[model samples]
Target: RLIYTAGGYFRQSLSYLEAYNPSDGTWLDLADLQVPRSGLAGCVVGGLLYAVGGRNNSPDGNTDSSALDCYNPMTNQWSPCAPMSVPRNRIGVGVIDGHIYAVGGSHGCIHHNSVERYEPERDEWHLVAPMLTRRIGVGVAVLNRLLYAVGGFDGTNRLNSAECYYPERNEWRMITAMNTIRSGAGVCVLHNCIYAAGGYDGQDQLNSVERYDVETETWTFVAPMKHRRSALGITVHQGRIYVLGGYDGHTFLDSVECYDPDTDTWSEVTRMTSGRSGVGVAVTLE
Candidate 1:
């Protein structure tokens, strides 16, 4: 399996796309995004990687992007798809029933709860039921076909609250809150549980990690990362959780770390060529 990380912010928004081979500890550069952005999200569907909504922070000003760009690995090129109904940055995204869901995010300072669903066959986006609360930089994951939207900043404060959407119902319901208020956390599903790691908590960047077991409806503290980071990228490969570059308060980081559920520990791994924050990460079938 290979891990792909797309556009993100460091000193400024980036268009760079790179892949990492966990088994060999090597990295490979890929095609750049047509529009440079940060606070975006990426996922693979039908073997093609899609980079979704984000913002371009240029010297001119900040611009939110609704552009949907798809990368064909075979051709090593990106093709634009139909844009979203609304521009969003710091967005969360997931794929359900072969349809892509663009979740909550902010447009400038206005937080949004509205959600959108994309049909690749039609190359169009349609509005879906909005979430229970407005959220930005939320962590999205799927469990038992349910789309979970986890912690994020909700305008006035960081949020610990979470929610889940059911496609059959086209509705969202509140879920058990996390143990900590987190924004920009790296989140992924492994072993039927959702894990959220390293994010900002209003006052400071965090190194703490936590897990949510839907069966138990509870969150438990887990082994913390060695580095304090937020806006990092996370994905699961061969049952191991990998967290990539992000900001650690004073500095942007190129550091990469992996967590083993069997051992319940995190260890440093290979680093990226450059530090990145607000990066989008996903695992692709090799």
Candidate 2:
């Protein structure tokens, strides 16, 4: 799903909910969010879609929101869930063992190293092991029971550095960094590998793409995106990597393109309703 309420244009934050179907290459509108938002982190656990902390002009506290809301696809309804420990936007999220993990992002001014986990059964959240580094706009993925925290900004520079967390031990350890420094890249786990695509390199919007092989522990360059983008929403569905809306250093983009690992090629598909950046996307773990 591609969601935008109030982003760059800010006409009440959109309040739109659009779902993409891989079968026919089309998008369908469903129940919209209660409030417009950007920089929200999202994930699927059990069978519901949870949209964690992000801005909605509500500013619950600390000058931002710890707002945690969810969507019921079967019923096409949205409802509030227990909020995060801190108000944040530009966050990253991952699901492991049916728990939703929220990673670093910004709240008003502070960039966070704080990590939290959500239990659907309990309808609650609690702190987990934090990242080794504090960052905003980071990307996260779960592979083989471990969580990978990918590149993001640390309030200083765009980072190429990366790390991982083992839930069993509640510990985080450093890992290999990407060759290209980036912030706001799209991350997805495909075929047991982590694929990161387009983001800002602190100098320019990037068209570069790469994937990390968990077996060998290295980042390899793949076909670059057709457009340079930063802050796009990405998801793995029907066995392809879909890169959604973002900025290209020039204009807001409503474009949608995807990559097929089998062919090692990229194909631009249908466009979204409008140009947007900082959107949230999720695929059902079921």
Candidate 3:
């Protein structure tokens, strides 16, 4: 399997797109994004990698992007899709029933309660039911047919709360909140539960991890990572959660780690060439 990480901030926002080969623990440089961005989110749909809304610091200064860029692996090229109605950065993205859902994120200092759904077949984006609370840098994952939006920064506060969106009803409902308030955490579903790891709370960067059991609707503490991380990229591959670079308060990170759900432990993995915060990651079959 191949895991891809694209677009993030190091010293400045980046357009770099790189992939990791888990079989050999190697990395490969690929096509860069059309727009250099940070705080965007990514996911695979019908074998295409979709990089959604994020912001950039241009000559014009800081601005939000509504842009959606889709990468065709076969062609090794990226092309634009219809932009979102609302521009956002630090967004959360998930795919459900083949459609892409863009969760709450911020525009400038304004955190958003807005959500949008993209129909790839139609190449269009449309607004959906907004979240109950405005969030930025939220972690999102689809578990058991529902899209869960977890801890992130509201305009004024870091949030421990979480909620899920039901497309069948076009509604979002509060679910169990995480034990620790987190912003920019990495989230993925593994072993029948959603795992959220490493993020910044209002006070500091965190190494703590937690899992939410859908069947029981409760959040439980899990093994903590060795490094405190925020804005990390996370994805489940071959039964393990692979966490990539992020900020650890004092500096950006190049360290990588993997979590084994069965053993409840974290192990160090190969590092990336450079640190990446606000990175987006997706896994694709080779």
**Local distance difference test, each candidate:** 0.92, 0.82, 0.91
lDDT of 1 at 82: 99
List TM-scores for all candidates, in order: 0.98, 0.93, 0.97
Per-residue lDDT tens digits for candidate 1, residues 1-286, read 6899999887779999999998889999998888899999989988989999999987778899899999998999999999999998999999898899999999887899999999999999999999999999899999999999999988998999999999999999999999999999998999999999999999989999999999999999999999999999999898889999999888889999999998999999899999889988888853
lDDT of 3 by residue, 1-286 (tens): 6888989897778898999998999898899998899899989988899999988865667888889999988888999999998888999999899999999888887788999999999998889999999999999989878999999988888999999999999999999888999999999998889999999899899999999999798899988999999999999999999999999987899989999888999998889889879888999943
Instruction: Indicate the worst ten consecutive residues by lDDT in candidate 2.
Output: 3-12
C-alpha positional error of residue 129 in candidate 2 after TM-score superposition, expressed in Å: 0.9
lDDT of 2: 0.82
lDDT for predicted candidate 1 compared with the true structure: 0.92
Candidate 3 stretches greater than 4 Å from native: 58-60
Weakest lDDT window of 10 consecutive positions for candidate 3 = 54-63
Between prediction 1 and prediction 2, which has the larger lDDT?
1
Give the per-residue lDDT digits (tens) of candidate 2, residues 1-286. Answer: 4322223222323466777776677777778787677788667776777877777643352245688888888899899999889987788889898898989999888999999998999989999998999978899988999999999999988899999999999999998999999899998899999888998898899989999998798999999999999888899877788888888987888888989998988888878888888888876653
Candidate 1: minimum summed lDDT over ten consecutive residues — where? 277-286
